[PDB]
């Protein structure tokens, strides 16, 4: 009979409770105080303009119909009580396919404080949409947003707020760093009003600032393209009479330049404009053709030539001048 005390409390709270109506329907505005604990920021898929994020989506509001007087102040209740009470219909504005985890029980909790303050946290994975601007690929920064708010309740019915200070209302766990390509720098939050045909809704916006690490693309694209240009420019060090030998340098370097041009263009989506990596490839695609038509010049005029004695110095020079000015205008933005 020791648990009949707590049984009679919960049967009394739900007696006459209407869970289809928000608390304070005709009196005030239901302030829902929220904060996010990010257990792991998942990988950003740049092909699909999306990122995954695992949150502990905490919410808290006030309900005056759930007041109780008992032996304990807080009621760390089971999960199935949360479906028998009013909970806010917070959806994500830019979510795409986001899953609430169900193993083994539903991963939600509900705590009811004795004055009527409620806490209701959910464990979610959110496959949100991050519109990114790939002009400075791969030396680019992105601010992937996560916008959430009410669905059916306007700004005169349910308003949102942060629990702690807005600097301390989105926390990222230290061990959760599932990004392999990008680099999370920090998070900034905001609040505002959106306009719809049904009404005005309070939106809650947070941004996750990411900077892409270029260490993968140096050893995949930037160094094999540099080594191809040097492989094209060693052809000036040969003799004029080796016509089949120098055209092996001419053909195979431009044939491996156009494979990297493609092998590299498949990473990022079908982009209409040209990225900053495509400006490095196209200039390097011009240096191998500038070496190939240099050989066709000296083969048509076939002692040592003044063309090869000038292209042995100018071609490593003008490639170095471009290489100095390309990185300095992009790494220091």
């Amino acid at each position, epitope marked *: 009979d020791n648990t009949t005390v707590f049984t009679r409390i919960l049967d009394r709270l739900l007696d006459g409770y209407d869970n289809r109506l928000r608390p304070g329907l005709g009196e005030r505005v239901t302030e829902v105080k929220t904060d996010i604990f990010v257990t792991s920021f998942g990988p950003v898929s740049d092909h699909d303009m999306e990122y995954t994020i695992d949150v502990f989506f905490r919410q808290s509001w006030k309900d005056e119909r759930l007041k109780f007087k008992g032996p304990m102040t807080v009621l760390r209740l089971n999960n199935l009580m949360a479906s028998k009470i009013w909970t806010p219909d917070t959806f994500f504005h830019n979510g795409k396919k986001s899953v609430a985890h169900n193993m083994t029980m539903p991963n939600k909790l509900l705590r009811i404080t004795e004055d009527g303050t409620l806490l209701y946290t959910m464990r979610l994975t959110v496959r949100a949409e991050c519109p990114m601007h790939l002009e400075d690929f791969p030396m680019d920064a992105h601010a992937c947003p996560l916008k959430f708010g009410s669905y059916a309740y306007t700004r005169a019915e349910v308003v949102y*707020e*942060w629990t702690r200070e*807005p*600097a301390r209302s989105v926390v990222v766990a230290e061990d959760g760093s599932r990004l392999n390509q990008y680099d999370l720098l920090g998070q900034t939050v*905001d609040s505002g009003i959106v306009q719809s045909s049904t009404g005005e809704y309070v939106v809650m916006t947070t941004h996750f600032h990411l900077k892409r690490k270029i260490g993968y693309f140096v050893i995949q694209t930037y160094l094999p393209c540099i080594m191809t240009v040097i492989l094209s420019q060693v052809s000036f060090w040969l003799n004029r009479e080796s016509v089949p030998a120098r055209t092996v340098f001419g053909v195979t370097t431009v044939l491996t330049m156009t494979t990297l041009s493609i092998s590299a263009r498949n990473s990022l989506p079908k982009v209409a404009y040209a990225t900053a990596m495509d400006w490095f490839i196209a200039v390097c695609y011009a240096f191998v053709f500038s070496a190939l038509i240099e050989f066709a010049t000296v083969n048509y005029f076939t002692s040592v030539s003044k063309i090869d004695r000038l292209s042995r110095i100018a071609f490593p020079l003008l490639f170095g001048i471009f290489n100095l000015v390309y990185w300095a205008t992009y790494l220091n933005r």
Partner: antibody
Amino acid sequence: VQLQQSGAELVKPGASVKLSCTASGFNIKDTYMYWVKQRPEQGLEWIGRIDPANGDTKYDPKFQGKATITTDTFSNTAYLQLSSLTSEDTAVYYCARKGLRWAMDYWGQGTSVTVST
Amino acid sequence: NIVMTQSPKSMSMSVGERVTLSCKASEYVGTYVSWYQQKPEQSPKLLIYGASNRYTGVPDRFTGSGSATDFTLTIGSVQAEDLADYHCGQSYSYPTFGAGTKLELK
């Protein structure tokens, strides 16, 4: 609605002072309590905040070890505590609460401290 | 820590014209930038909670504009009851305030 503070006091330097801010029309357990230092002909200066639900208190880095706040739920009043006050801290103390967008909507009438002879 | 600078320190204008306040933060404060007036030997009150969101009871001549860093308070027509200096605050972190901006009437 109505925010009330106690009247002004005269204190000697090196002594301790007690200052109160009584809230009426609303309970303290849901909204934060903000206290702010207003020097004469100068701007405002926040000194500390109070979360009365769990008793959490976070101070300004300048005023660490200078101010202390206790808050009684039954008395509907929060208390100042200035232990090592000097003669430079001659100002008026205002009471505030967290508003709609973390603003300070309701303010007290303000109590001015005076440290002289 | 966050610092707020209000420019200029003071100004002197008459009744019924345009004034533009200025308030710039050290780093990003999103929208939680509050404007407070201080009538002499009274208590402060609230003008704009958040950015560009008027409080209840203040006249419609007061308006603001919000951004990431810079925030302005604009009064279309200065009246005879606005004898107060205006303080620009912030709330994205632990709150801090500017030095205020005094004004006077001819």
